[PDB]
Structures are given as C-alpha cells and as structure tokens.
Amino acid sequence: GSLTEDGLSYKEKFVVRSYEVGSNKTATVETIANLLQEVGCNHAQSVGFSTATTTTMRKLHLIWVTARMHIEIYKYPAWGDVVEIETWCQSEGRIGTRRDWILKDSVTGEVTGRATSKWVMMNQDTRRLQKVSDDVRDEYLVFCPQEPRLAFPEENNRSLKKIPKLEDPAQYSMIGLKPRRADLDMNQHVNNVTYIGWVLESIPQEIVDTHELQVITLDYRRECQQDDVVDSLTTTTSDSQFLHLLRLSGDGQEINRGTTLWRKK
Amino acid sequence: GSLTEDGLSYKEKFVVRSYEVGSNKTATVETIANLLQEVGCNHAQSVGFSATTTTMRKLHLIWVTARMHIEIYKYPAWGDVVEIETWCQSEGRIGTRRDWILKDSVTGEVTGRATSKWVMMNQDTRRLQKVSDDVRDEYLVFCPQEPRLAFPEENNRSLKKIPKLEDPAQYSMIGLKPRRADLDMNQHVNNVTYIGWVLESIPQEIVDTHELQVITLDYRRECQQDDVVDSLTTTTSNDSQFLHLLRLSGDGQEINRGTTLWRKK
Numbered sequence: 001g002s003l004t005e006d007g008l009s010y011k012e013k014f015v016v017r018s019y020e021v022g023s024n025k026t027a028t029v030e031t032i033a034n035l036l037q038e039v040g041c042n043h044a045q046s047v048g049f050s051t052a053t054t055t056t057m058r059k060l061h062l063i064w065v066t067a068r069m070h071i072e073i074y075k076y077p078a079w080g081d082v083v084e085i086e087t088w089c090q091s092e093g094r095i096g097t098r099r100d101w102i103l104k105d106s107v108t109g110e111v112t113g114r115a116t117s118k119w120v121m122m123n124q125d126t127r128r129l130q131k132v133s134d135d136v137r138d139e140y141l142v143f144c145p146q147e148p149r150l151a152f153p154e155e156n157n158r159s160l161k162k163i164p165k166l167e168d169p170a171q172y173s174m175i176g177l178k179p180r181r182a183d184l185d186m187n188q189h190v191n192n193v194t195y196i197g198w199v200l201e202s203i204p205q206e207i208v209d210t211h212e213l214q215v216i217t218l219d220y221r222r223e224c225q226q227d228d229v230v231d232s233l234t235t236t237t238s239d240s241q242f243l244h245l246l247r248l249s250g251d252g253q254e255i256n257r258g259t260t261l262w263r264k265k
Numbered sequence: 266g267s268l269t270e271d272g273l274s275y276k277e278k279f280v281v282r283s284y285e286v287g288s289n290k291t292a293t294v295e296t297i298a299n300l301l302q303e304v305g306c307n308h309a310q311s312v313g314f315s316a317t318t319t320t321m322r323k324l325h326l327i328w329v330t331a332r333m334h335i336e337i338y339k340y341p342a343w344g345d346v347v348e349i350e351t352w353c354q355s356e357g358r359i360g361t362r363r364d365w366i367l368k369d370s371v372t373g374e375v376t377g378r379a380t381s382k383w384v385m386m387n388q389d390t391r392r393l394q395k396v397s398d399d400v401r402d403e404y405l406v407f408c409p410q411e412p413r414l415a416f417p418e419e420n421n422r423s424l425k426k427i428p429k430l431e432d433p434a435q436y437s438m439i440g441l442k443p444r445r446a447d448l449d450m451n452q453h454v455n456n457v458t459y460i461g462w463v464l465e466s467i468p469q470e471i472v473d474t475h476e477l478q479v480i481t482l483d484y485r486r487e488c489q490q491d492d493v494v495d496s497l498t499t500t501t502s503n504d505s506q507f508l509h510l511l512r513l514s515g516d517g518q519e520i521n522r523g524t525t526l527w528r529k530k
C-alpha cells in the first residue's frame with residue numbers, strides 16, 4: 001500500500017482469502033471491517049504514528065476510541081478477487097476525528113462499498129472522554145485534507161441517524177457470548193470487529209440464507225472485558241430492517257446498539 | 266503466489282496484518298495456521314482442483330484433516346513478510362500428507378515448519394475409507410515422487426501418539442461455542458478454531474512467561490454449529506509441556522486431543 005500523490009489519503013490492495021468468505025464464496029462483513037482497520041493502521045504508520053497516537057497524546061496517556069462504525073456494501077468481493085481500499089481522515093472540531101473509506105473492484109474500478117467511522121479521545125487509564133486538545137489537534141491537521149471529503153456526503157444520510165434503544169422482549173437473541181484470545185487485539189482489548197460478529201449472531205438463519213447484508217451502523221458505548229459475557233438482541237423494525245442491542249449478561253449494561261438493512265437475494 | 270519451477274510445490278508471501286498479532290506484536294499461531302490453509306488452498310487451485318478430484322466429487326468423497334503438527338522458531342512480526350512453501354505427498358492407501366516450510370523473506374532463514382495428515386471420507390455418511398487406485402492416480406502427478414518431509418528426524422514429534430487426558434483436568438475452559446466467523450464457506454467449523462479452543466485453557470501466567478514452540482492436534486469428530494465444547498489442559502512436565510482434550514458438553518464425546526510445548530521467554 002501507499003499514500004496517494006498529495007499525501008492526504010492511503011490506498012491498499014487485498015486478495016480475498018479462502019477463510020475470509022462466507023457460504024456465498026464472497027468476503028464476510030467482518031472480513032471487510034478487518035480490512036478497513038488494516039488499511040487504517042497502514043495509513044497511520046506511513047505518516048509517523050506510534051507502532052496510533054501523536055507525540056502529545058502519548059505523554060498525556062490519551063488514546064483514540066471508536067464511537068461509531070457505518071458500513072454500506074453494494075458488492076462483496078469474491079474469494080480470489082482483489083479489492084482496493086482508499087482511506088483518509090478529517091477532524092471534526094473538538095468533538096473528534098472521522099475516518100472514511102471507499103472500497104473498489106480493482107479490475108473494473110467500480111465502487112463496491114463505503115464506510116465512515118467516528119472517533120473520540122479518551123484517557124487510557126481513567127477512560128474519560130475529553131474532546132480534542134489545542135496543540136494535540138495541530139499535530140495531525142497536516143495529514144488530513146483541508147476541504148471536506150465525505151464518503152457519505154448526502155444531507156441527513158444513514159451514517160448520522162440516531163439509533164433508539166431496543167425494548168424487551170427482543171424478537172431474537174443469542175446469549176452467553178464470550179470472547180476468546182483470537183478476539184483480542186495486541187493491547188489485550190476486544191477487537192472492534194468482534195462486536196459486529198456478535199450483533200449478527202442473533203439474526204435468524206432464514207434471513208442470512210434469503211437476504212444479503214447491505215447496511216450496518218454500530219454505536220460503541222462501553223468495552224466488553226475479557227471476563228465479561230454478552231447477550232445479542234435483535235428485533236425486526238420493517239427490504240428487511242433490524243434494531244440491535246449488545247449488553248452484559250448479568251446487570252444488562254449496554255455495550256453497543258445498532259441497525260442493519262438487508263436486501264432479498 | 267506461484268507453483269515452483271518443477272510444478273511440485275507452491276510458494277506464497279504474506280505481509281503480517283495488525284489484527285493478526287498478539288501482545289508480543291508477532292503473529293499468533295492461529296494466524297500461522299490460517300496462512301497454512303490459505304497457501305494450501307492456492308496450491309490446489311493452481312493445479313486444477315475445486316479441493317477434490319473428478320472421481321471424488323462423483324463418489325461424494327472429501328478430504329478430512331486427521332492431524333496438524335506445527336513447530337515455530339520465530340513468529341513473524343507485524344509488517345514482516347513471511348514466505349511459505351507447501352507440497353503434498355501420498356502415503357499409500359492411508360491418505361495424503363501436506364507439509365509446509367515457513368521462512369523469513371529478508372534473511373531466507375527457516376522460522377517454522379508444519380505437517381498435516383489427511384484422510385478420505387464420504388461427505389454424507391461421514392465414513393472413512395482408504396484411497397482407491399483411480400482417485401490416487403489423479404493427484405499423484407502433482408506430488409514429488411521422492412520423499413520430501415518437513416520433519417525427517419528418526420523419531421520426530423509429528424508422529425508421536427497422544428494419550429487421553431484423565432479427569433480431573435488441571436485447567437479448563439467451559440462452554441466454548443462457535444459463532445458465524447468460525448464457519449468455513451461450507452458452514453463447517455474452521456480447523457483453526459479447534460487450535461484456539463485448545464489454547465483457551467492454558468493459564469494466563471504461561472502465556473505471559475512462555476512462548477508456544479510446538480502444537481500437535483489430533484482431529485476425531487467435528488463440533489457442529491449447535492454443539493458446546495469444554496477445553497481441558499494438564500501439565501505433563503526450563504520447558505513446559507501440556508496434554509489437551511476437547512470434548513462436547515454433556516456426554517463428553519471427544520472431538521480433539523493434543524499436546525503443546527513451551528519455552529521460557
């Protein structure tokens with residue numbers, strides 16, 4: 001992969017692996033989300049970030065936390081196909097940063113998907129959110145385009161829609177979900193993609209067999225720790241549309257909420 | 266990737282991804298095992314398979330893994346390129362064997378080696394059978410005629426018989442269940458998932474002070490999508506050695522047994 005000519009975005013190509021595809025022999029949405037995070041890490045590495053915080057974030061013990069992921073897929077890449085992903089970052093005042101991605105077919109150059117993510121700043125020890133510092137923002141404004149470049153430019157698009165809280169009784173549920181070592185990142189935290197897989201565990205088999213996942217929006221509220229247990233709840237709100245809630249198995253503390261949209265095959 | 270000059274083996278290079286590494290910022294053994302299966306799949310694709318022969322598909326016959334043995338000297342770091350060469354060899358009517366050699370792309374030094382034993386099974390009845398003459402003759406043209414073993418040693422660890430763990434186990438991880446991410450494109454649990462499940466019962470203290478050097482896993486029965494697994498581990502020993510048993514919750518039907526060897530960091 002490499003930074004583009006103007007140094008303000010990054011591109012990388014991936015060959016879809018055999019173990020990265022589902023029953024329809026095209027890449028799963030968890031494989032897509034892993035590729036989004038991988039090209040995001042290579043972008044930060046290419047501009048000098050920690051091997052992904054700045055000089056001042058490191059001394060203040062500040063980190064980036066994902067607040068929201070929104071993915072829209074038109075065509076999932078087949079096993080053996082090459083998918084090219086371009087990513088870039090943009091600041092959003094003191095509220096946080098945004099990282100967008102565009103997925104393309106390498107042969108046709110056609111856009112097969114797009115994604116947007118909202119990141120917030122948090123003290124790694126206290127887990128307290130704190131907006132963005134005056135001279136912390138100055139350290140990374142040089143690696144972001146100055147004019148707005150949005151993957152979802154539409155006014156009032158699906159990526160910014162507020163998600164309600166699912167009320168019991170849920171229509172479908174998958175309970176007692178627990179992470180294993182494969183689910184941890186290099187910092188021993190549960191990987192953000194694991195939450196996507198957990199949301200989708202409560203989608204009935206019949207839906208997965210007759211429909212294709214087109215849109216997923218996931219809010220991140222609290223992390224599931226290595227010794228926590230998760231319940232995945234899903235209710236139909238309708239194409240097929242669903243409301244989702246991940247909560248810790250005991251007290252019922254919310255960790256995530258989201259919606260999915262599905263097209264009939 | 267590509268077949269080598271003589272067409273009797275296959276080589277492929279992989280850049281280690283950010284989400285593929287553990288706390289030591291080097292690739293996990295599950296990432297290694299996924300790469301072994303990926304280069305295995307590209308080798309079969311390059312020789313005309315899709316991965317059974319013309320007679321196997323007609324007779325509803327498939328390849329099933331009976332044993333995996335991996336030995337790692339140095340795990341590839343995040344961002345490093347690892348080159349893997351793989352080949353197959355027939356072992357008479359018992360079945361076939363696929364071996365792999367892992368190398369550092371920059372230094373050319375061997376950083377690991379693996380061997381696997383495969384058997385033939387009727388996909389519907391789940392009944393094992395010896396390889397027939399007409400099925401064997403179909404793939405003998407893609408295997409070297411002289412023996413080429415990743416583990417040539419007089420009495421190497423790859424062929425050692427593994428005993429059955431007796432209760433009470435020293436360590437256990439109970440109620441392990443697969444999710445959709447764990448399934449392959451045929452809706453069967455991925456062979457690498459069993460490795461992760463064996464390692465769930467290794468105490469945290471071991472993982473922090475030791476490095477996994479050797480893993481041998483026998484495969485006996487599959488865990489189905491609605492099955493629940495218990496992972497049991499007992500110390501059998503500078504080095505640390507363990508005996509492992511995976512069994513279904515309830516009746517306690519064995520699905521796997523194995524051993525691991527660990528060196529102090």
Ligand SMILES: NC(=O)c1cccc2[nH]ccc12
Pocket residue numbers: 040043044047049052053064088089090097140143144
């Ligand atoms: N990945 C990051 O930490 C990041 C944050 C803000 C702007 C950026 N531009 C390239 C990478 C990056």
Ligand SMILES: NC(=O)c1cccc2[nH]ccc12
Pocket residue numbers: 305308309312314316317352353354361404405407408
């Ligand atoms: N992977 C396979 O299906 C296979 C089986 C037997 C011999 C082989 N030689 C290359 C690939 C291969």
